[PDB]
RNA sequence: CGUCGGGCCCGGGGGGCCACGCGUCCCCCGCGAGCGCACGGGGUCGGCGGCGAUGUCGGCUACCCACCCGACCCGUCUUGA
RNA sequence: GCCGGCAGUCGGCAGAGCGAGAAAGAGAGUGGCGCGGACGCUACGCCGCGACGAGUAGGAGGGCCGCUGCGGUGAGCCUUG
């Protein structure tokens, strides 16, 4: 009856300075701030939960107004708790600084 | 259900957006049809970053996935009933397609003939 | 060289031995033992700077 | 005619035998083991006798056909795959099932099935969880075990038992199996203190709790 | 033909060199034997510490 | 008619099977000699090192007669004298590798091109990760990967090289058939160095990575491959 | 002959139809209707054709005579096949293989006769 | 004197070997067949779960809007727009 | 680019191959029940490997890109458009 996902912030796309690659996303899970301790979240499912105007279907429940884009955490990023995630569809870029849910059910430990 | 193709591969396209001619958005006399920029100082011609893309050979689709519909058939224009029987050995990978100049009187005869030969028609109810 | 090669081509023709006939570049220096007779290799030293001019 | 012996060499490394083939020649003793050297059925018809044909040629052919595909060698189907288990997941340990409808409930593990799905059963009185299957990936394995070795798990329950048939009504066999398991496992968890209350509580993350930090 | 790495693929390695079978069979018994001798050698040190 | 024609097809199939097995025994046993030969040279240099230290002498080892040359600079802005040598060593791309034997023609070719290459003397193991993982053959002017021993045996098999270890021993121990062995191998398409390079522009002496990597090339080879 | 007249018909025939990235040929006696050297009903000495019967029930099978050319009134002979849809294919199969009659169109003629029989039947429920 | 040296580790009085047959002479000290597992010439499952006829599914393009990054107006003269 | 391969679909007029380390033949002789076998090859076609792919002035090739009219050709379309 509580929370089954970790708090994670979409900090931006994979980019240099004058280029930006939209197909890979950079994530900030609050709580992790070191390279050696990002191994737990490798391969975990990450989902960006938002809601829209029109009604859409929902598995195992009534149709509601919320939609998601499913994703997966690929590998770590620059020894600061930054970590890379790949989604099925690229982020709308309106979720920068917005919190998404990264899950634990793709677990190994 | 309908007439399915013999094989249904995953149709992949390297680019789905159309190729837009340079400065066709600013002016009306410049059409959407592509023209190669042949200037001496053109951002499109020397491929400046953040500009429109030029059509190259690398944007060509796979030879196996070329020229099918999303349904998985190749189109073939059909004028009358006599040109419908040629597709009797290609109904599993080719569909019949009716021209715009076919009258509604004999358009119905082509449709029911194609049902007998089990040939898919992409416009089965056009004129009614 | 041609005259010397043809002398060594007629020679060892009745013997059959493949003597090295072509010229070869400088090979590696054929690993060898180097000795010092009791004494230790004397230490060398960089000179201190003095303004000669 | 001969009884089939097992492999003589033990498995040293996968794909590697411990003994060489020259040593195996002594072991197999091949030195003293050398050697040297339908479609038509007749049936009577009340005419004469008719010769019928089995697997007769088809009455229809399609316009075009696919050719056969190339022969892969290691592409085994699902039933013949080898099934692994984590070192943490042992029979008796407490699990955390997440992806199911019993979200975050603390549910007790029993055994691994043939398909690889885990027989997991947290007591119906405590967790309201029946004899249910889970997947290994979607489970957090808490390091809390019980002495479950001395139990008699029924043999009739298997992958075919928990497979969905097609409103869903609970069968009498499911209730009987639940009571039979409950008589076995529930007195055991009562012996260790505070675990029955531990099962009833639900796992959930809160503020200042990061799964990579704490241990389970 | 797809090129499989002989360093990671065992029987691609064995297609190109059958001596790799014994070269992998060796450096396994020797490593297992030297592991057994070193453990009991520390047990001899344990026997020296006890006495 | 076909009764003895059946014997024609089976016996010829049997003839190739014993012929294939006879060659399979040769590949195994030549490699067994080569493992003894690799243990021969590695240990005998340790033999010579200790005995000179037994007395008051020194054992100067011979400079190895093979080095591995890697081009580490691109093709933009290259001197024609430099450019001619790089296409004479089959180094046309960046991070390409080739085997070059050592003689007075070779270092003098190498001492004019050291800002553009990084070369050094490889180890015995370092040959294996190149021949097996990056080994490609120039068969009929086509870059064919070495997936079977039959490929080498048809361009160098009448030279005595019919397998990996016959090729590796001709590479590592620079024998008298070495020239076409290096010609058979395509220049190695090594990947970019994992972990990064120190400095591409300057020589290895002042902390760069260009020039003679006489010993530390074995560290860099595992990063290329 | 046969190879001589193929190079003329291959590009300027009245039966040739390209029409947006295919090629077809609509002459009589051309099963599979491809504009190909093998699949041509006119240039050959021996020609196999499958075409539905005039009454809408059965298949009339057309053979070339090989005894007299340049006489198209008597060059072709038509035989009607109307059987139980399994011996229908078996009869045409025996006309090719047993007669050694230009055998590369053995199976393709069976393919065409198979699809005709589903035209002469109820089609939609 | 030294070498876990080199000669299939020359020769005589506990562990690994892709070494296996019978008969004759001299020198030295060409078909045996049978099945199975698989690091073997490029993916398969002989594995499944859900939501759907009056509000939902898919529509890469195509109409509009929102966000991130990039992005100076085309042609010409010119070494240089 | 390959001295590239494919006329071999040679079927009770039959025996279904020439990827295989090594210059040449699955060659002829003469004494001691069940009728069966997927695709193909517009050879200006089909299929297999290897390498490469920037570009001004400029040159070459392919257009089943397009417009107009003419000789043939589609038992072509069209007042039910």
mmCIF file of N, CA, C and O in Angstrom, chain D residues 38-78:
data_model
loop_
_atom_site.group_PDB
_atom_site.id
_atom_site.type_symbol
_atom_site.label_atom_id
_atom_site.label_comp_id
_atom_site.label_asym_id
_atom_site.label_seq_id
_atom_site.Cartn_x
_atom_site.Cartn_y
_atom_site.Cartn_z
ATOM 1 N N UNK D 38 4.738 -49.666 -47.641
ATOM 2 C CA UNK D 38 4.451 -48.763 -46.532
ATOM 3 C C UNK D 38 3.303 -47.820 -46.874
ATOM 4 O O UNK D 38 2.342 -47.694 -46.116
ATOM 5 N N UNK D 39 3.413 -47.155 -48.026
ATOM 6 C CA UNK D 39 2.393 -46.199 -48.437
ATOM 7 C C UNK D 39 1.122 -46.881 -48.928
ATOM 8 O O UNK D 39 0.030 -46.320 -48.784
ATOM 9 N N UNK D 40 1.238 -48.075 -49.503
ATOM 10 C CA UNK D 40 0.101 -48.772 -50.086
ATOM 11 C C UNK D 40 -0.335 -49.932 -49.202
ATOM 12 O O UNK D 40 0.489 -50.735 -48.757
ATOM 13 N N UNK D 41 -1.641 -50.009 -48.952
ATOM 14 C CA UNK D 41 -2.250 -51.088 -48.185
ATOM 15 C C UNK D 41 -3.343 -51.720 -49.036
ATOM 16 O O UNK D 41 -4.182 -51.015 -49.606
ATOM 17 N N UNK D 42 -3.326 -53.047 -49.127
ATOM 18 C CA UNK D 42 -4.316 -53.779 -49.905
ATOM 19 C C UNK D 42 -5.552 -54.041 -49.054
ATOM 20 O O UNK D 42 -5.448 -54.559 -47.938
ATOM 21 N N UNK D 43 -6.721 -53.678 -49.585
ATOM 22 C CA UNK D 43 -7.987 -53.857 -48.893
ATOM 23 C C UNK D 43 -8.993 -54.506 -49.835
ATOM 24 O O UNK D 43 -9.027 -54.174 -51.030
ATOM 25 N N UNK D 44 -9.816 -55.422 -49.335
ATOM 26 C CA UNK D 44 -10.834 -56.042 -50.186
ATOM 27 C C UNK D 44 -12.113 -55.222 -50.235
ATOM 28 O O UNK D 44 -12.564 -54.655 -49.237
ATOM 29 N N UNK D 45 -12.695 -55.158 -51.433
ATOM 30 C CA UNK D 45 -13.947 -54.447 -51.663
ATOM 31 C C UNK D 45 -14.940 -55.405 -52.304
ATOM 32 O O UNK D 45 -14.637 -56.077 -53.295
ATOM 33 N N UNK D 46 -16.138 -55.464 -51.730
ATOM 34 C CA UNK D 46 -17.179 -56.346 -52.227
ATOM 35 C C UNK D 46 -17.827 -55.858 -53.508
ATOM 36 O O UNK D 46 -17.868 -56.578 -54.507
ATOM 37 N N UNK D 47 -15.965 -56.759 -58.132
ATOM 38 C CA UNK D 47 -14.806 -55.891 -58.217
ATOM 39 C C UNK D 47 -13.495 -56.612 -57.970
ATOM 40 O O UNK D 47 -12.876 -57.128 -58.899
ATOM 41 N N UNK D 48 -13.072 -56.648 -56.708
ATOM 42 C CA UNK D 48 -11.833 -57.308 -56.347
ATOM 43 C C UNK D 48 -11.204 -56.746 -55.089
ATOM 44 O O UNK D 48 -11.873 -56.597 -54.063
ATOM 45 N N UNK D 49 -9.912 -56.430 -55.158
ATOM 46 C CA UNK D 49 -9.185 -55.865 -54.030
ATOM 47 C C UNK D 49 -8.590 -54.530 -54.446
ATOM 48 O O UNK D 49 -7.942 -54.437 -55.493
ATOM 49 N N UNK D 50 -8.810 -53.505 -53.630
ATOM 50 C CA UNK D 50 -8.324 -52.166 -53.925
ATOM 51 C C UNK D 50 -7.042 -51.881 -53.156
ATOM 52 O O UNK D 50 -6.897 -52.248 -51.987
ATOM 53 N N UNK D 51 -6.104 -51.219 -53.832
ATOM 54 C CA UNK D 51 -4.842 -50.831 -53.215
ATOM 55 C C UNK D 51 -4.912 -49.356 -52.845
ATOM 56 O O UNK D 51 -4.640 -48.481 -53.675
ATOM 57 N N UNK D 52 -5.285 -49.069 -51.598
ATOM 58 C CA UNK D 52 -5.383 -47.688 -51.149
ATOM 59 C C UNK D 52 -3.989 -47.129 -50.887
ATOM 60 O O UNK D 52 -3.009 -47.863 -50.735
ATOM 61 N N UNK D 53 -3.902 -45.804 -50.842
ATOM 62 C CA UNK D 53 -2.641 -45.103 -50.651
ATOM 63 C C UNK D 53 -2.743 -44.195 -49.435
ATOM 64 O O UNK D 53 -3.700 -43.423 -49.310
ATOM 65 N N UNK D 54 -1.760 -44.290 -48.547
ATOM 66 C CA UNK D 54 -1.666 -43.393 -47.407
ATOM 67 C C UNK D 54 -0.800 -42.195 -47.765
ATOM 68 O O UNK D 54 0.149 -42.307 -48.548
ATOM 69 N N UNK D 55 -1.145 -41.043 -47.183
ATOM 70 C CA UNK D 55 -0.504 -39.760 -47.475
ATOM 71 C C UNK D 55 -0.588 -39.445 -48.970
ATOM 72 O O UNK D 55 0.420 -39.287 -49.663
ATOM 73 N N UNK D 56 -1.821 -39.371 -49.462
ATOM 74 C CA UNK D 56 -2.044 -39.101 -50.872
ATOM 75 C C UNK D 56 -1.694 -37.652 -51.208
ATOM 76 O O UNK D 56 -1.647 -36.774 -50.341
ATOM 77 N N UNK D 57 -1.429 -37.416 -52.492
ATOM 78 C CA UNK D 57 -1.014 -36.104 -52.963
ATOM 79 C C UNK D 57 -2.158 -35.096 -52.839
ATOM 80 O O UNK D 57 -3.325 -35.443 -53.035
ATOM 81 N N UNK D 58 -1.847 -33.840 -52.516
ATOM 82 C CA UNK D 58 -2.899 -32.881 -52.168
ATOM 83 C C UNK D 58 -3.781 -32.493 -53.343
ATOM 84 O O UNK D 58 -3.383 -32.544 -54.509
ATOM 85 N N UNK D 59 -5.012 -32.114 -53.002
ATOM 86 C CA UNK D 59 -5.982 -31.664 -53.988
ATOM 87 C C UNK D 59 -5.801 -30.202 -54.377
ATOM 88 O O UNK D 59 -6.342 -29.781 -55.406
ATOM 89 N N UNK D 60 -5.058 -29.422 -53.593
ATOM 90 C CA UNK D 60 -4.850 -28.011 -53.884
ATOM 91 C C UNK D 60 -3.388 -27.644 -53.682
ATOM 92 O O UNK D 60 -2.726 -28.164 -52.780
ATOM 93 N N UNK D 61 -2.896 -26.735 -54.523
ATOM 94 C CA UNK D 61 -1.597 -26.115 -54.338
ATOM 95 C C UNK D 61 -1.729 -24.598 -54.397
ATOM 96 O O UNK D 61 -2.460 -24.069 -55.240
ATOM 97 N N UNK D 62 -1.038 -23.874 -53.524
ATOM 98 C CA UNK D 62 -1.050 -22.411 -53.595
ATOM 99 C C UNK D 62 -0.157 -21.910 -54.724
ATOM 100 O O UNK D 62 0.639 -22.649 -55.301
ATOM 101 N N UNK D 63 -0.305 -20.617 -55.028
ATOM 102 C CA UNK D 63 0.384 -20.049 -56.183
ATOM 103 C C UNK D 63 1.894 -19.997 -55.986
ATOM 104 O O UNK D 63 2.645 -20.401 -56.881
ATOM 105 N N UNK D 64 2.360 -19.513 -54.837
ATOM 106 C CA UNK D 64 3.788 -19.458 -54.554
ATOM 107 C C UNK D 64 4.022 -19.935 -53.127
ATOM 108 O O UNK D 64 3.117 -19.896 -52.290
ATOM 109 N N UNK D 65 5.236 -20.418 -52.874
ATOM 110 C CA UNK D 65 5.618 -20.962 -51.580
ATOM 111 C C UNK D 65 6.948 -20.381 -51.118
ATOM 112 O O UNK D 65 7.788 -19.983 -51.932
ATOM 113 N N UNK D 66 7.122 -20.316 -49.799
ATOM 114 C CA UNK D 66 8.412 -20.000 -49.186
ATOM 115 C C UNK D 66 9.354 -21.183 -49.374
ATOM 116 O O UNK D 66 8.899 -22.334 -49.442
ATOM 117 N N UNK D 67 10.659 -20.958 -49.471
ATOM 118 C CA UNK D 67 11.609 -22.067 -49.357
ATOM 119 C C UNK D 67 11.887 -22.389 -47.896
ATOM 120 O O UNK D 67 11.538 -21.634 -46.986
ATOM 121 N N UNK D 68 12.518 -23.542 -47.680
ATOM 122 C CA UNK D 68 12.902 -23.919 -46.325
ATOM 123 C C UNK D 68 13.996 -22.997 -45.800
ATOM 124 O O UNK D 68 14.798 -22.447 -46.561
ATOM 125 N N UNK D 69 14.026 -22.838 -44.483
ATOM 126 C CA UNK D 69 14.996 -21.983 -43.816
ATOM 127 C C UNK D 69 16.253 -22.773 -43.474
ATOM 128 O O UNK D 69 16.244 -24.005 -43.406
ATOM 129 N N UNK D 70 17.344 -22.042 -43.264
ATOM 130 C CA UNK D 70 18.611 -22.672 -42.933
ATOM 131 C C UNK D 70 18.551 -23.295 -41.540
ATOM 132 O O UNK D 70 17.769 -22.886 -40.676
ATOM 133 N N UNK D 71 19.393 -24.302 -41.330
ATOM 134 C CA UNK D 71 19.318 -25.152 -40.143
ATOM 135 C C UNK D 71 20.190 -24.565 -39.040
ATOM 136 O O UNK D 71 21.420 -24.619 -39.108
ATOM 137 N N UNK D 72 19.549 -24.002 -38.020
ATOM 138 C CA UNK D 72 20.252 -23.611 -36.811
ATOM 139 C C UNK D 72 20.524 -24.840 -35.948
ATOM 140 O O UNK D 72 19.866 -25.877 -36.074
ATOM 141 N N UNK D 73 21.506 -24.715 -35.060
ATOM 142 C CA UNK D 73 21.985 -25.849 -34.277
ATOM 143 C C UNK D 73 21.734 -25.724 -32.782
ATOM 144 O O UNK D 73 21.431 -26.726 -32.131
ATOM 145 N N UNK D 74 21.850 -24.525 -32.212
ATOM 146 C CA UNK D 74 21.681 -24.362 -30.781
ATOM 147 C C UNK D 74 20.351 -23.794 -30.345
ATOM 148 O O UNK D 74 20.205 -23.432 -29.174
ATOM 149 N N UNK D 75 19.379 -23.706 -31.251
ATOM 150 C CA UNK D 75 18.139 -22.975 -30.986
ATOM 151 C C UNK D 75 17.121 -23.940 -30.386
ATOM 152 O O UNK D 75 16.174 -24.391 -31.035
ATOM 153 N N UNK D 76 17.332 -24.258 -29.111
ATOM 154 C CA UNK D 76 16.439 -25.150 -28.396
ATOM 155 C C UNK D 76 15.137 -24.432 -28.045
ATOM 156 O O UNK D 76 15.119 -23.214 -27.855
ATOM 157 N N UNK D 77 14.032 -25.165 -27.953
ATOM 158 C CA UNK D 77 12.769 -24.563 -27.519
ATOM 159 C C UNK D 77 12.736 -24.360 -26.007
ATOM 160 O O UNK D 77 13.663 -24.726 -25.281
ATOM 161 N N UNK D 78 11.632 -23.764 -25.548
ATOM 162 C CA UNK D 78 11.536 -23.318 -24.159
ATOM 163 C C UNK D 78 11.558 -24.487 -23.181
ATOM 164 O O UNK D 78 12.118 -24.375 -22.084
#
